[PDB]
Amino acid sequence: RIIYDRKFLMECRNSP
Amino acid sequence: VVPGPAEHPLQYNYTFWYSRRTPGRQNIKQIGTFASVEQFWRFYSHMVRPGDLTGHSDFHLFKEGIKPMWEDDANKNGGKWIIRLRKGLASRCWENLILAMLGEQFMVGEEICGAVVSVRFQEDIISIWNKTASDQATTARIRDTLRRVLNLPPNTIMEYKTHTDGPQRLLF
Numbered sequence A: 001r002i003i004y005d006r007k008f009l010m011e012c013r014n015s016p
Numbered sequence B: 001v002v003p004g005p006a007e008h009p010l011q012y013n014y015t016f017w018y019s020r021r022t023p024g025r026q027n028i029k030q031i032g033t034f035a036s037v038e039q040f041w042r043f044y045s046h047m048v049r050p051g052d053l054t055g056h057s058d059f060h061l062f063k064e065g066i067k068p069m070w071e072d073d074a075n076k077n078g079g080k081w082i083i084r085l086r087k088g089l090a091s092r093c094w095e096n097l098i099l100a101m102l103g104e105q106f107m108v109g110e111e112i113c114g115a116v117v118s119v120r121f122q123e124d125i126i127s128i129w130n131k132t133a134s135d136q137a138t139t140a141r142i143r144d145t146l147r148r149v150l151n152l153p154p155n156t157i158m159e160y161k162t163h164t165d166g167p168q169r170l171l172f
Helices: A006-012 B037-044 B090-101 B135-147
Strands: B011-023 B029-037 B058-064 B079-085 B112-119 B124-128 B157-161
Touching: A006 B037, A006 B090, B029 B037, B037 B090, B058 B090, B079 B090, B079 B112, B079 B135, B090 B112, B090 B124, B090 B135, B124 B135, B135 B157
Parallel strands: none
Antiparallel strands: B011 B029, B011 B058, B058 B112, B079 B124, B079 B157, B112 B124
């Protein structure tokens, strides 16, 4: 399963 | 719709939907579909937060191929957990919930269908839909996960409803 932590998900928000 | 070059793929594609209806009552449309984390932010960072929506209104975020209506094959034997919130809480709750759902925090196999935030007159309602209402290990796990991922007021009622299950109500 592809699992993402909340922190990680938020950090991706600043990547185009 | 496929994740791009060096994007971070998800466990599923999802589709954002929006609806505006009247209480007491085709009025539901697709906003967009995404296959990666970067693509999700591309929709979500440009969307109106549910706390700034007007009317009897809902955002729905569902696994691609599942329609946010109970009659849908993936939904017909299912149900949802419901959390009723005072005005001011829905936007932060909706974000924490969709990030948990997307990041696969629920750990219930294929049971998750999607999430709905409903703006009403004097409350907001967040819900998460699953495939099998009678699967007590799944609905129990979903309930507990919601408690882990949302910052709720003390005393907060959570309620499960199977989809099949004085004066008239005028405002809502």
